[PDB]
Design a protein around this ligand. Structure first.
Ligand SMILES: C[C@H](Cc1ccco1)C(=O)N[C@H](CC(=O)O)c1ccc2c(c1)OCO2
Length: 167
């Protein structure tokens, strides 16, 4: 038993809700919140900008030190950093950004990072400003992630669509 509420169950291990991931995180304090990161950990907009703003820019400060020490992430890769006031940990995961021409097949590799964590609150990778089809992203999520994932979808309209078209 865990503290997530109001989720619709899609599969044995995948759950979905129309919610703002920022407010969802401040209420659950999940062990892991996933950020829709880029390779530079520049949290300017989308989910990343919203999460970072909710940390009063502490996420960005920590991220800049990480990059200065380690260099950029790989597309499809991830790193674990602090969750600040939102979660114990933040798993920064880089899905491919279609608006940069990145290979969509890397979306499966990106979701594989979720399997290193027993339970996660997460957005749909490569959705939103990353330009992928959220329905394809949901399919890859369901077919790749084996751990327990709670997907927060900000847009109510999108959410209804994802549910109604789910196979
Ligand atoms: C089709 C809709 C358009 C839309 C955007 C906002 C409302 O509708 C869409 O791309 N949605 C994705 C996925 C989602 O809805 O979780 C998304 C991603 C990041 C976000 C985000 C929304 O909003 C805040 O950061």
């Amino acid at each position: 038993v865990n503290s997530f509420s109001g989720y619709l169950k899609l599969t044995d291990n995948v759950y979905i809700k129309n919610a703002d991931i920022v407010e969802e995180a401040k209420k659950v304090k999940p062990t892991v919140v996933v950020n829709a990161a880029n390779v530079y950990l520049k949290h300017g907009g989308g989910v990343a900008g919203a999460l970072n703003k909710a940390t009063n820019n502490a996420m960005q400060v920590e991220s800049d030190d990480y990059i200065a020490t380690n260099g950029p992430l790989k597309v499809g890769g991830s790193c674990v950093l602090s969750g600040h006031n939102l979660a114990k940990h933040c798993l920064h995961v880089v899905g491919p950004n279609v608006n940069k021409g990145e290979d969509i097949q890397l979306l499966k590799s990106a979701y594989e990072n979720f399997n290193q964590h027993e339970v996660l609150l997460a957005p749909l990778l490569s959705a939103g400003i990353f330009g992928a089809d959220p329905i394809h992203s949901l399919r890859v999520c369901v077919d790749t992630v084996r751990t327990n994932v709670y997907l927060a979808v900000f847009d109510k309209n999108l959410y209804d669509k994802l549910v109604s078209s789910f196979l």
